[PDB]
Amino acid sequence: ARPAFVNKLWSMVNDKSNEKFIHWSTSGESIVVPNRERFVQEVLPKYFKHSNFASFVRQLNMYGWHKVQDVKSGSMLSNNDSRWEFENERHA
C-alpha cells in the first residue's frame, strides 16, 4: 500500500528533469514515450542508477501497471518499436 516506487513515479512522469520527454497520454491511465531513445539513454539511469527498460517494466507489473505488446485489431499497427503507451491494466 503506497510503495516508494509509485511515489517516485509521480515525479518522473511529471516533467521536471524529463521536461519534454515523457508526458501523459491524455488525462492519466496511460503514459506515452515519444522518444524512448533520448529518454532511456538520458532518463532511465537518472533514477535507477544503471537499470534497463526491461527492469522498468518489471516494477510496473509487480506494482499494478503493465506493458502493452498485443495485436488484436490494429488496422495498420505492428509497424513501430520506438513509441508505445504504457497501460494501467491490460489483463487480470
* CATH number of the domain where residue 54 is located: 1.10.10.10
Experimental method: NMR
Residue whose C-alpha is closest to residue 44's, from 34, 52, 35: 52
Q: Which ranges of 21-79 does DSSP label H, i.e. alpha helix? A: 36-41, 53-63
Residue with cell 539513454: 41
Round to whole Å and give the CA distance between 35 and 32. 9
Provide the domain limits for residue 55: 1-92
Number of domains the chain contains = 1
Ramachandran region, residue 27 (left: φ > 0; alpha: ψ -120 to 50; beta: rest): alpha
Q: Quote the crossing angle between the two packed helices 53-63 and 4-12, to the nearest 10°.
A: 120
Round to whole Å and give the CA distance between 85 and 89. 12
Element (DSSP H or E) covering residue 81: none
Q: Is residue 26 helix, strand or coil?
A: coil
- In three-state form (DSSP H/G/I as H, E/B as E, the rest C), the secondary structure along 68-80 is CCCCCCCCCCCCC
